[PDB]
Amino acid sequence: MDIDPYKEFGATVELLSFLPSDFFPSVRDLLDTASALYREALESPEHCSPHHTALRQAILCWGELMTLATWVGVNLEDPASRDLVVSYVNTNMGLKFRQLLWFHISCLTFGRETVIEYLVSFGVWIRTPPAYRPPNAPILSTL
């Protein structure tokens, strides 16, 4: 169906590709940040924003993923397969979750215009050859 996760929010998968995979923070940290700042809003019955809706969708599905992982951990009788499956869900389905959690949580804190402006600049920086790349990578701050 050629659905793009970020197209509605004015970004593309290509634009996010500029950031390296390693850059995105760990799932636990992102979830803690989301809970700390937006738990009340996320659980509220009002539609605060589209981004809030997207974050809720991402959370509830990751939850379902961990549920299936728990399912293979308690049912599968093979430790070889048990390990393989769980490893594809925490590493391969986790790197996509990390990317979406970062975009939405960052668009909620900084603003989506700011988030997309940060994606172009980090791109310019990572493209800079190391001999000229400044030691301070771009960072999103509101101080």
| Contact set for its own copies, span 28-67 (CB under 8 A) | 29-37, 39, 42-48, 50, 52-61, 64
CB of 3 to its own copies, least distance (A): 4
3-state secondary structure of 123: helix
Integer Cα distance of 34 and 126 in angstroms: 27
- Residue 128 engages its own copies in binding (rule: CB under 8 A): yes
Residue 83: how many CB atoms within 10 A of its CB?
13
CB of 92 to its own copies, least distance (A): 7
CB of 34 to its own copies, least distance (A): 6
CB of 35 to its own copies, least distance (A): 5
What contacts 20, CB < 8 A, 6 or more positions away?
A: 126
CB of 114 to its own copies, least distance (A): 7
The answer to whether the beta carbons of residues 103 and 16 sit under 8 Å apart is yes
Integer Cα distance of 26 and 98 in angstroms: 7
Q: Which of residues 83-102 bind its own copies (CB under 8 A)?
A: 84-85, 88-89, 92-93, 96, 100
Integer Cα distance of 26 and 142 in angstroms: 22
